[PDB]
C-alpha cells in the first residue's frame, strides 16, 4: 500500500534550482507530511533510513520589478516575469515555446539539515512530521 501513496501521481516540471539531494548523491522527489504518531510506528517497523541530507537554506531567489519590468509596469500596465532574457532572446530570434532558460542560473548555496529520507521502492521520498516543530503550543489546529 505504501508504495501506492507514491507512484500514482504524475510529476509536473523540473527546475535545476531546487536542489534537494541526499548527502553525496540521489535527489528527492517526495514530501509525505504526517503526524508524529503515524511517523512513529511507520519508520519503526516498515521502512528504512538514509538521513541528514543537503538542501538550500537560501530562500528561493528573487523577482524584483527592475528597469525591465518597472518601465512596462506603470507606463503600459504590462508585466513579464524576467523580461530581460525573453526580451533579449526574442530580439535575437527576430534576427534569427523552446525557452529553456526558465530557471537554471547559478545553483545557489546548500547546507546540511536534519532530514529524514526513506526508500519507498524506487523513489527517494522525504518524510517529516511536524507538530512539535511549528504547530506546537498555539491555538491553531493541526491540518
Amino acid at each position: 500500500w505504501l508504495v501506492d501513496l507514491t507512484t500514482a501521481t504524475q510529476p509536473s516540471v523540473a527546475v535545476p534550482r531546487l536542489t534537494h539531494a541526499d548527502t553525496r548523491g540521489r535527489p528527492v522527489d517526495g514530501v509525505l507530511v504526517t503526524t508524529a504518531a503515524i511517523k512513529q510506528r511507520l519508520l519503526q517497523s516498515f521502512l528504512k533510513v538514509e538521513d541528514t541530507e543537503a538542501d538550500v537554506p537560501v530562500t528561493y531567489g528573487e523577482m524584483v520589478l527592475n528597469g525591465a519590468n518597472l518601465v512596462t509596469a506603470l507606463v503600459m500596465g504590462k508585466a513579464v516575469r524576467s523580461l530581460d532574457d525573453v526580451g533579449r532572446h526574442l530580439l535575437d530570434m527576430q534576427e534569427e515555446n523552446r525557452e529553456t532558460l526558465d530557471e537554471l542560473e547559478s545553483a545557489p548555496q546548500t547546507t546540511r539539515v536534519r532530514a529524514d529520507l526513506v526508500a519507498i521502492g524506487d523513489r527517494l521520498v522525504f518524510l517529516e512530521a511536524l507538530e512539535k516543530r511549528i504547530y506546537a503550543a498555539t491555538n491553531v489546529p493541526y491540518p
Binding site: 504524475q10 515555446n97 523552446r98 525557452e99 529553456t100 526558465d102 530557471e103
Partner: protein
C-alpha cells in the same frame, strides 16, 4: 502558457507526463490543441 511567447522559454521541468485534462480540469485556462491552431500566431 496563455501568453505563448512567454512559453518560448519554458524555464522549468515539464516532468510528470500524465494525461492532462482527464484530471480535475482545475486549470483557470487550458487549451487541448492538435498540431496547429491560428490563435497561436
Amino acid at each position: 502558457g496563455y501568453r505563448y511567447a512567454a512559453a518560448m522559454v519554458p524555464t522549468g521541468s515539464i516532468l510528470s507526463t500524465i494525461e492532462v485534462a482527464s484530471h480535475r480540469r482545475l486549470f483557470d485556462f487550458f487549451a487541448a490543441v492538435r498540431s496547429d491552431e491560428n490563435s497561436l500566431y
